[PDB]
Amino acid sequence: SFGSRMEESIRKTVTENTVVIYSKTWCSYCTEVKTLFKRLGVQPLVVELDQLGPQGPQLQKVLERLTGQHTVPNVFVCGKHIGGCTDTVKLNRKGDLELMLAE
Amino acid sequence: SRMEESIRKTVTENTVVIYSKTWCSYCTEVKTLFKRLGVQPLVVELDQLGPQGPQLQKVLERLTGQHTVPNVFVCGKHIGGCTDTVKLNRKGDLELMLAE
Numbered sequence: 001s002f003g004s005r006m007e008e009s010i011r012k013t014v015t016e017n018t019v020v021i022y023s024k025t026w027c028s029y030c031t032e033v034k035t036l037f038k039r040l041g042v043q044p045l046v047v048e049l050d051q052l053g054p055q056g057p058q059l060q061k062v063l064e065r066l067t068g069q070h071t072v073p074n075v076f077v078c079g080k081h082i083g084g085c086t087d088t089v090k091l092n093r094k095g096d097l098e099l100m101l102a103e
Numbered sequence: 104s105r106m107e108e109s110i111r112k113t114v115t116e117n118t119v120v121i122y123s124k125t126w127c128s129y130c131t132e133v134k135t136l137f138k139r140l141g142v143q144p145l146v147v148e149l150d151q152l153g154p155q156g157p158q159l160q161k162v163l164e165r166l167t168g169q170h171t172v173p174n175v176f177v178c179g180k181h182i183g184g185c186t187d188t189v190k191l192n193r194k195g196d197l198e199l200m201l202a203e
């Protein structure tokens with residue numbers, strides 16, 4: 001099915017890239033996690049859901065099916081789900097993100 | 104225009120007005136701070152407003168020069184956005200308009 005395939009694209013994108021951020025261009029919280037990986041000399045793979053037409057809300061429902069989170073940003077580092085803005089922020093004050101980025 | 108009148112009226116007739124989006128965590132943060140202070144604000148959710156929401160967001164930019172949400176109004180005066188409102192709350196300068 002389409003929903004299976006979409007679920008499989010995400011598992012793939014997340015295993016293949018260091019940082020993946022599911023995102024919306026108009027969202028400050030999203031801008032903030034993006035900005036945070038930049039200040040670390042990391043370039044995240046960024047999927048802007050609002051730029052995918054009807055596929056954006058599908059992806060969001062599929063992310064929620066996968067990870068239980070429906071909100072953006074939805075953040076994966078090194079194949080693992082982090083997964084929100086205050087979770088990524090808190091995991092980068094406690095400094096454990098510098099570490100898990102390696103490699 | 105009929106939107107300008109709507110804004111000018113909503114604003115002078117409620118202590119706090121928040122032009123907002125239901126899905127926006129900054130908006131939610133501003134609604135939450137006013138609640139901690141005892142005020143229940145008048146929230147206008149631009150996304151619940153059919154094709155008018157984006158029309159409204161443009162009128163507020165002309166009257167305010169601010170394109171973003173949340174757009175916050177305190178005692179008829181435009182205090183701007185979320186960090187701008189957070190700034191005034193950490194200070195204590197926010198209860199001082201809310202007193203009047």
Ligand SMILES: N[C@@H](CCC(=O)N[C@@H](CS)C(=O)NCC(=O)O)C(=O)O
Pocket residue numbers: 024027029060070071072073083084085086087126127128129
């Ligand atoms: N505390 C969560 C907030 C996430 C959240 O509430 N996101 C809003 C955008 S700021 C949202 O996803 N709303 C629903 C949507 O845009 O689909 C986090 O830190 O990531």
Ligand SMILES: N[C@@H](CCC(=O)N[C@@H](CS)C(=O)NCC(=O)O)C(=O)O
Pocket residue numbers: 026027028029124127129170171172173183184185186187
């Ligand atoms: N620093 C501003 C941030 C405002 C902002 O960039 N808001 C975003 C949503 S978080 C926005 O207006 N996006 C475009 C739109 O919603 O039309 C504030 O404190 O309020």
Ligand code: FES
Pocket residue numbers: 026027028029030126127128129130
């Ligand atoms: S849409 Fe405003 S913080 Fe996410």
